[PDB]
Amino acid sequence: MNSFYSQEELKKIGFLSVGKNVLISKKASIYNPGVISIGNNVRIDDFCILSGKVTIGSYSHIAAYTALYGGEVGIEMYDFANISSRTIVYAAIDDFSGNALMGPTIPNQYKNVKTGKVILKKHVIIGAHSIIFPNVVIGEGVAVGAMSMVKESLDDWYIYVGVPVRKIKARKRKIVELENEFLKSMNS
Amino acid sequence: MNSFYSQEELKKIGFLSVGKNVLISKKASIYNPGVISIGNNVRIDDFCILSGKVTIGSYSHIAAYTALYGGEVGIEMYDFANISSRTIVYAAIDDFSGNALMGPTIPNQYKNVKTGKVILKKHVIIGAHSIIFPNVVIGEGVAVGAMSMVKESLDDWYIYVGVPVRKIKARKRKIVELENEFLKSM
Amino acid sequence: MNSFYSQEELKKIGFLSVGKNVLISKKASIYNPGVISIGNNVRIDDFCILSGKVTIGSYSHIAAYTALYGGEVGIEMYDFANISSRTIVYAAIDDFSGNALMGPTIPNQYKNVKTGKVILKKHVIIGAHSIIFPNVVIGEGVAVGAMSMVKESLDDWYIYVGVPVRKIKARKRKIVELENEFLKSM
Ligand SMILES: C[C@H](O)CC(=O)SCCNC(=O)CCNC(=O)[C@H](O)C(C)(C)COP(=O)(O)OP(=O)(O)OC[C@H]1O[C@@H](n2cnc3c(N)ncnc32)[C@H](O)[C@@H]1OP(=O)(O)O
Numbered sequence: 001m002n003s004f005y006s007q008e009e010l011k012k013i014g015f016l017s018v019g020k021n022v023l024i025s026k027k028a029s030i031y032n033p034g035v036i037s038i039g040n041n042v043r044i045d046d047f048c049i050l051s052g053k054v055t056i057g058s059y060s061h062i063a064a065y066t067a068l069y070g071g072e073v074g075i076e077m078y079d080f081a082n083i084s085s086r087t088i089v090y091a092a093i094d095d096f097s098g099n100a101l102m103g104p105t106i107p108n109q110y111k112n113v114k115t116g117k118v119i120l121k122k123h124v125i126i127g128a129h130s131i132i133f134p135n136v137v138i139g140e141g142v143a144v145g146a147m148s149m150v151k152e153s154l155d156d157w158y159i160y161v162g163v164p165v166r167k168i169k170a171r172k173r174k175i176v177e178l179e180n181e182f183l184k185s186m187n188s
Numbered sequence: 189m190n191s192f193y194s195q196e197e198l199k200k201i202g203f204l205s206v207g208k209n210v211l212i213s214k215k216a217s218i219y220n221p222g223v224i225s226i227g228n229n230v231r232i233d234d235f236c237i238l239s240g241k242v243t244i245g246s247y248s249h250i251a252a253y254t255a256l257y258g259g260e261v262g263i264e265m266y267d268f269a270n271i272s273s274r275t276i277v278y279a280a281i282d283d284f285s286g287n288a289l290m291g292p293t294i295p296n297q298y299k300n301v302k303t304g305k306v307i308l309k310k311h312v313i314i315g316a317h318s319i320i321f322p323n324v325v326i327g328e329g330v331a332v333g334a335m336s337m338v339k340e341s342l343d344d345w346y347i348y349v350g351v352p353v354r355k356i357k358a359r360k361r362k363i364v365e366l367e368n369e370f371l372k373s374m
Numbered sequence: 375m376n377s378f379y380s381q382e383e384l385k386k387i388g389f390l391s392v393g394k395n396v397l398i399s400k401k402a403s404i405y406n407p408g409v410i411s412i413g414n415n416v417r418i419d420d421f422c423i424l425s426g427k428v429t430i431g432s433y434s435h436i437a438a439y440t441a442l443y444g445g446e447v448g449i450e451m452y453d454f455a456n457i458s459s460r461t462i463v464y465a466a467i468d469d470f471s472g473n474a475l476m477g478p479t480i481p482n483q484y485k486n487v488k489t490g491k492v493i494l495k496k497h498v499i500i501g502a503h504s505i506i507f508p509n510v511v512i513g514e515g516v517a518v519g520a521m522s523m524v525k526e527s528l529d530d531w532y533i534y535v536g537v538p539v540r541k542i543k544a545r546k547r548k549i550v551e552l553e554n555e556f557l558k559s560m
Pocket residue numbers: 061062063082083084085126127128144145146147148159160161162163168464466467468470471476477478523537538
């Protein structure tokens with residue numbers, strides 16, 4: 001079986017924009033579709049939450065249980081980015097230091113929210129069960145491993161692991177040759 | 189949108205007690221609501237599970253995917269405590285040692301269940317993707333970092349991290365002033 | 375309350391095979407039930423996903439949020455195996471090296487998918503918030519701790535923790551006696 005919205009159901013959601021061959025589980029939660037833009041060949045699985053400003057490009061899988069909280073500043077994924085199961089991307093988070101009250105039950109003047117656009121560049125893969133914090137640019141071709149925590153931007157074409165992550169090895173660039181091949185074969 | 193019960197449907201759930209401005213997701217699961225008590229100004233998000241004896245105070249967010257397994261002994265949160273997404277708090281867990289059988293498919297006499305009330309004191313924050321095991325007090329103003337695991341009671345006003353957690357620095361107590369200031373305004 | 379199908383409805387899913395005393399949440403997702411078999415005395419909780427080929431024996435709990443992505447090669451659990459909440463078992467994953475494109479939006483010829491059957495032998499327990507990767511045999515009686523990642527087969531009767539896992543101590547085998555004692559009683 002599958003849990004995906006039909007094309008009929010999709011156009012009734014009211015995305016700021018949505019492309020072709022978009023498969024979106026009826027069991028995901030989509031909050032504020034008015035600020036959510038999605039390209040072509042995108043699949044979003046059961047129990048995902050997309051909230052606030054989120055922009056997804058094309059050829060991207062958001063695997064089950066993944067939450068994207070784009071808030072006002074937004075989360076943006078470029079083409080060929082993918083996010084494995086049970087990841088959270090936060091574009092805003094509370095201050096844990098004890099210098100501020102916390103969370104949605106408390107008015108803003110008492111909090112100290114850190115917020116900043118989160119960008120996943122082309123070919124980024126986030127491994128399962130990871131967390132990405134606000135104001136983070138995940139550079140082009142970065143892979144982060146399973147159970148990763150990323151609090152700061154990550155330099156392009158490396159593999160990172162750990163809590164918080166550290167750089168462990170280069171990511172190979174062959175995938176860019178494969179991208180160009182795949183795309184060329186779609187044009188001719 | 190929003191996925192929350194109206195005041196009207198909340199009253200119909202049959203909670204032991206429920207305050208005002210309580211926003212519970214329709215995509216949460218609530219089992220045994222008659223032993224669940226929720227104070228005022230509480231938000232419980234999609235895909236949470238509250239099961240068995242659970243008591244939440246006021247000014248508390250239980251973020252999405254979080255499971256509170258209160259059992260008979262209970263989990264209690266005090267005011268201004270908050271739990272980030274994908275946390276589990278267990279009040280009962282099976283013995284992993286190899287000395288017992290395990291889980292809800294096996295009769296009690298064969299299992300060796302560790303159980304004890306769990307309490308999150310005032311101003312506790314539990315970071316995302318964390319697990320709290322039974323019979324523990326998360327002390328007043330403690331912050332536990334993301335992806336951490338707690339098996340013992342935690343001393344007040346520290347920040348802890350890791351699996352299992354260790355203490356890394358004091359929690360600032362400015363939030364106490366902020367609490368007083370806020371409530372006054374109220 | 376509880377969320378399970380009645381045995382009446384269980385029959386209308388179309389599992390390859392499904393035993394008695396099987397409690398499957400209505401809030402779990404089951405994909406390709408035709409290649410799923412389940413034994414007796416099994417409980418699968420809310421927000422689980424069972425996808426592709428998955429064979430579960432008897433006296434097993436698959437706790438809330440757990441996903442079992444069996445693909446074509448399959449995941450198999452033997453009797454008395456249990457999986458705690460928020461675990462993922464993968465029978466197929468993409469190559470992260472940069473030598474291949476990845477995931478379901480891309481044709482197979484550009485990918486380099488690692489696939490291989492995952493087997494949890496009798497008495498295996500997997501701790502919460504864990505990840506098991508393809509082509510892994512988790513040996514009889516193995517316990518894996520919470521928040522652990524397993525990429526290789528694990529030796530029988532040991533306890534493993536960490537990311538990726540390391541062996542820490544032997545598992546006690548009193549359970550083998552308990553199983554014998556319990557089966558008699560029936
Ligand atoms: C979205 C699309 O649909 C795709 C999918 O969903 S695929 C399904 C999801 N898949 C995953 O999440 C896979 C994640 N894979 C990993 O984490 C892999 O371990 C990895 C690619 C990051 C590294 O693997 P590999 O390159 O084989 O490196 P390996 O030799 O195993 O480990 C190198 C070092 O990192 C450590 N390490 C590896 N993975 C780690 C992790 N996730 N966290 C912490 N440490 C890790 C090892 O301990 C080792 O340290 P040492 O050098 O100090 O001994």
